[PDB]
Amino acid sequence: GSGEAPNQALLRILKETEFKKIKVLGSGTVYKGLWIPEGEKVKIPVAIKESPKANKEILDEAYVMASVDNPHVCRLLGICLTSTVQLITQLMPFGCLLDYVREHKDNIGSQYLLNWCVQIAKGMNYLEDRRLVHRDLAARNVLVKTPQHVKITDFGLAKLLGAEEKEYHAEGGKVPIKWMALESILHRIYTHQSDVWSYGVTVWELMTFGSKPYDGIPASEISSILEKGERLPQPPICTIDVYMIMVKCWMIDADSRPKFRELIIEFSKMARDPQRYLVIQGDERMHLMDDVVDADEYLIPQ
């Protein structure tokens, strides 16, 4: 069969003196700050995220993030091996998409929603090209650079498949059940097609402006609900065209679900006439240092 090519990604090790924490974003503790590579005359806005297991898991996450490079996947700039390990990534000023849609629900129109669906599917399709199964796709794990540009984040559960490997068989780790494909709940099997199921839930989160899936239903009960054929409901703004795509992502036969590359196509077609596909009140009106350089303009030799 086919073999594996070497992974020549470079893991950049940053010195603590090169980056400055400016303020806490959340809580390990994540800080907003600036990375100032010496003699380079640039200030890059960064997020700085500061137990042997915890250390092993953050290094596995750094390893995956160092191995991805795509406009719709979050950028790792490097790691800092201080007493406490630090992960330095591009600052995404608007935070996660879930919180964003909840906060700006009255100003999110159909064009933004459909474009986000396209961009998330682009990032996922890229991960599929890299044989990476994300295993934690959700609106909480999409970050907002601008209202017009989102990127996938959180590679804490992600796994690289071999050239001839179709599935990742998990052990007993904790996993977000309400976003999981049925075969993952029942059999601990993860594939690109189970990521597609999670994509459908993510789209549902967006289309409801941040509702909780299966709210108030115990995760233990989700398996049986799905087996009886029930799924997340049609969001009020969604035409049947949009809901059909969601439902297809939740087919029990994983190979009957859409592929990410098909989701790009389908949502891009809808994004050309957004009010035909999402029916939103007030859609028409809805709207969202010299040396500072965004990470997307700070290219590091590969």
From Swiss-Prot:
Changing H134L: Found in a lung cancer sample; more sensitive to gefitinib than wild-type. Changing K49 to A/M: Abolishes kinase activity. Residues 19-278 form the Protein kinase domain. Changing Q86R: Found in a lung cancer sample. Changing L132V: Found in a lung cancer sample; more sensitive to gefitinib than wild-type. Changing E16G: Found in a lung cancer sample; constitutively activated kinase with higher levels of basal autophosphorylation; more sensitive to gefitinib than wild-type. Binding of the ligand triggers homo- and/or heterodimerization of the receptor triggering its autophosphorylation. Heterodimer with ERBB2. Forms a complex with CCDC88A/GIV (via SH2-like regions) and GNAI3 which leads to enhanced EGFR signaling and triggering of cell migration; binding to CCDC88A requires autophosphorylation of the EGFR C-terminal region, and ligand stimulation is required for recruitment of GNAI3 to the complex. Interacts with ERRFI1; inhibits dimerization of the kinase domain and autophosphorylation. Part of a complex with ERBB2 and either PIK3C2A or PIK3C2B. This is Epidermal growth factor receptor. The gene is EGFR. The chain holds residues 695 to 1020 of 1210 of the full protein.
